[PDB]
Amino acid sequence: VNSFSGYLKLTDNVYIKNADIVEEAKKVKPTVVVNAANVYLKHGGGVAGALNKATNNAMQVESDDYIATNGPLKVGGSCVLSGHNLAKHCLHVVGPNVNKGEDIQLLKSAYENFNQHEVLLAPLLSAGIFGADPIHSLRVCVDTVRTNVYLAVFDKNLYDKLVSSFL
Ligand SMILES: Cc1nc(Cn2cnc3c(N)nc(N)nc32)cs1
Known part of the structure; x- marks a missing residue:
């Protein structure tokens, strides 16, 4: 629980x-x-x-x-720092930023960092102003992370699109 x-x-x-x-x-x-x-x-x-x-x-x-x-850090890498008033720890994870020209294949490597933690609250990596497809990011998350991940999507319209399109 x-x-x-x-x-x-x-x-x-x-x-x-x-x-x-x-x-x-x-x-x-x-x-x-x-x-x-x-x-x-x-x-x-x-x-x-x-x-x-x-x-x-x-x-x-x-x-x-x-x-x-x-x-x-490396694109695809991470570090653990304090969570301050928000969490015990903050896992800072660098997904590829499509608007910087970075390789989207690195998104899987970025999600692999989550497997070092049993439970995480997380956003969809490389979505929003990082310019990748959120539907794609969600699929990579599901196919890469094996630990328990609780994703938060802030945009309601995006949330609706992600749910209805999820196979
Ligand atoms: C560069 C990235 N942006 C997002 C989307 N995004 C932007 N602001 C928020 C926020 N406050 N909460 C959540 N859950 N997602 C957010 C995901 S990766």
């Missing part, structure tokens, strides 16, 4: 809900929230900007120290 509520069950291990990731995290206080990060951990918009804003910029302060010590 876990604290997640109001989810559509997609498969054995993947669940989905129409929710803003910030509101959904503050309610559950999951062990792990996934951030849709970039390699520089510059949390400007999308999921990253919203989560960071909810931490009063503490996520960005922690992230800048991480980058100063370690350098940038």
